[PDB]
Design a protein around this ligand. Sequence first.
Ligand SMILES: *[C@@H]1O[C@H](CO)[C@@H](O)[C@H](O)[C@H]1NC(C)=O
Ligand SMILES: *[C@@H]1O[C@H](CO)[C@@H](O)[C@H](O)[C@H]1NC(C)=O
Ligand SMILES: *[C@@H]1O[C@H](CO)[C@@H](O)[C@H](O)[C@H]1NC(C)=O
Lengths: 237, 230, 211, 213
Amino acid sequence: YPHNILFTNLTNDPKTYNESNFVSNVLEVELNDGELFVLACELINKKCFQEGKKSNKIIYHKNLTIFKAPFYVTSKDVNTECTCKFKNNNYKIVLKPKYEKKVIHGCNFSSNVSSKHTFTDSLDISLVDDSAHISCNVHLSEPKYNHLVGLNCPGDIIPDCFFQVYQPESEELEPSNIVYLDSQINIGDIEYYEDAEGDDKIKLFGIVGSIPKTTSFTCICKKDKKSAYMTVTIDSA
Amino acid sequence: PHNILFTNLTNPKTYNESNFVSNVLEVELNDGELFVLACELINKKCFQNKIIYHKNLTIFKAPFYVTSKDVNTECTCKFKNNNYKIVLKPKYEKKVIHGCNFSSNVSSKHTFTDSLDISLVDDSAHISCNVHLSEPKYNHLVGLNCPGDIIPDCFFQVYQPESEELEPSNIVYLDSQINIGDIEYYEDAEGDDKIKLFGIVGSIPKTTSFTCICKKDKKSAYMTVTIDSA
Amino acid sequence: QIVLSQSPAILSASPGEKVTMTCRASSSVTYIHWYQQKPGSSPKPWIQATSSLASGVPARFSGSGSGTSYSLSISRVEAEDAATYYCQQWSSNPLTFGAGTKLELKRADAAPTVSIFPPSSEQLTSGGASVVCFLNNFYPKDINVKWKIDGSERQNGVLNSWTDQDSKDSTYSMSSTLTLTKDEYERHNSYTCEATHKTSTSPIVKSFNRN
Amino acid sequence: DVKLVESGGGLVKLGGSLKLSCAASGFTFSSYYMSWVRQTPEKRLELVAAINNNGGSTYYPDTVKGRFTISRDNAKNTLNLQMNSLKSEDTALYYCTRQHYGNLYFFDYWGQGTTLTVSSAKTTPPSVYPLAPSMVTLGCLVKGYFPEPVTVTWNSGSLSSGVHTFPAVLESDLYTLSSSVTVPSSPWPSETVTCNVAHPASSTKVDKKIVPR
Ligand SMILES: *[C@@H]1O[C@H](CO)[C@@H](O)[C@H](O)[C@H]1NC(C)=O
Ligand SMILES: *[C@@H]1O[C@H](CO)[C@@H](O)[C@H](O)[C@H]1NC(C)=O
Ligand SMILES: *[C@@H]1O[C@H](CO)[C@@H](O)[C@H](O)[C@H]1NC(C)=O
């Protein structure tokens, strides 16, 4: 009993889409987050994924192509035009994700305001004291999660976030170490994303579902003699 | 449906919990094969490449080249309070790489048709290493082993062939250059040596050529590839 | 023809800073070569094929970009990096260079070692009379020079020349020379060389009197 | 600018007790983990004690646990370390250094240190002996003093080039060192050369003019 996926039977030998669903031999299919598109037809040039005025995962098999829609994108209308053939007809499939302004739950330490990304919190590190260490806290407490957590650091980051993260602060005199985010939040499906706007590096990760236990971690951002750190806290149950 | 291995563990060759041996499932995925498993993954992640994880289902494509017969991607399912393990690795074929090994180490995991120790060439020089391919259908691996910088990003980007007249040669995307679709790419590193290659399956529209440049210290070299059909 | 625009024209930075220059192309280009030129010498190959470093180029240097936007970046600027940098394309005839980005490096605020010279007695016999005034090893580059003959300014006949930033000590140096006829030189007594620099509120003057 | 100033170090007899204080300036003292770290004669670094930002919890490695006691007065921007039952092994140069959870507990600031000497030997003044027989090399033997330091200068400091002041060494329980000065044959003995040895612990100053044998 599956759902979400879309199947395009355009050959001979689950929402089913066929020739009837085309308009003037065009299929303006609008994919959603974590939605798997499937087609079964002999493509013209054995290839599709391009620009037409971004494929995370595409598997090309004989007379069959599987595509999973990505979870984060900033392009308004980034499309893919699978041009196929069946019988004596030529059909084209235009895939495009639903435009949604996903707001990154994190701290923008940079000062540029013409960024392609939107952060819930922000702290211009360039204004911070030299030889200082200011915090920018971030918290989450939803039953189910579908969020993007990251930061925009104009300088070096510590550690490699968010594949590696920094353990939370100890009340007693105990050390805090660097761990892999996989083990820290104790889930499997962790998407990772990286981007760069000039000197500003921006690294983030996606979380989907409900976490096992309420967990917290930290990521450190330094620029010249100034420094800062973002503390994240996600709640279970 | 002719190249799908389906393993049904939830509620086109369909395997079930009978093909398992002691709750283990060794899967030899042919280069032209797909694997679709239907189960509830223990940690929802797997495969200690091109994989797609969708809800309670997972699909994996066979890689063209395999370095060690032991390398494998392992999934663990939990159906009816029971644990089943699926080991997936491609059929072990020691394919040769049609390219030039510029490095000097001989204990490599990769075998090249041609080779040219760049360490021996003169400083401030630019020596060529040509590799040619002439078959109607192709199923080959073309790459190089450079101990230093590689120009450009090979083989996703490549360098146009030399112009007879005084015209410049530019960097192009390999997909456009050879004009085929599902070009698989692969990278590797043995110490300082970089091993970048690409696969090629099927015929080719028009006989075309390209070049990839490898420099080390003051020494330099370049590999020119040429593939033909029609 | 492809126009390569280099910005900024002058890149001022203090040692250690992470700096980046930009090569903006009129149309799309597949690669950009980078060459470094320090005064007295020809251009030197620096960055090959957009990102590859020429032999001996320090790892702090880096190149990136594509299409109509390329760049060169220095992670921790060192004093020896002060020079002019040129980007070069050849994706279509003709091969074109960039205007250049001259790298200014911040330094200790240095006062110029001024020194004035009366015209040589050899030149006097020939009928001429040029007064030379050197202003060496100063920082910042911003500076002004005026000649005060017996108090009054004489901008007519003044030639000025400036060196680019010294790669060793990151300072600048300037030479000024007021030329005069032998007759006009004899008609006055005081010959002053006034210089206005950030290092002082009052101008650094250097005068000589014909006794 | 951030500044940490250790103070209070000196000579303590075996089993004695001493308190070292550290003055902090130029930052929010209350937001940083402070720690005392000492450097042995073997030039190794050892964490003595550490304290949290609010002064609540503390840690001491088993080597000194119970003996020493760290403390901080955030109102006065001070860090104190009361060391009791001092043993000879505690003889070291003690640094006052800071950390922050927001910089991965990095020691980004250290004071110049205060020198602790744990010994029962009695304070003994030095005995300067002259060392006399191209660039002629003269010497100045400082023998039988305690404790460190000793300042050896040549010609009241003017003679600085070609001067090697070798480190001091324990003979039985007293120190002994020497300083080698190398001048050309022309200025000596025509012009005078004198080594100025001072021992502040014993309140003693000696000036020995080097004459030929
Ligand atoms: C595609 O549709 C035709 C007609 O509805 C049907 O006969 C055929 O079996 C279908 N093929 C697949 C693979 O679903
Ligand atoms: C697949 O598994 C379900 C489990 O409920 C079973 O009902 C079904 O018959 C199975 N089909 C095959 C082809 O094994
Ligand atoms: C290859 O040979 C070189 C010899 O210099 C050695 O340093 C390197 O470790 C070797 N690589 C492997 C994978 O053994």
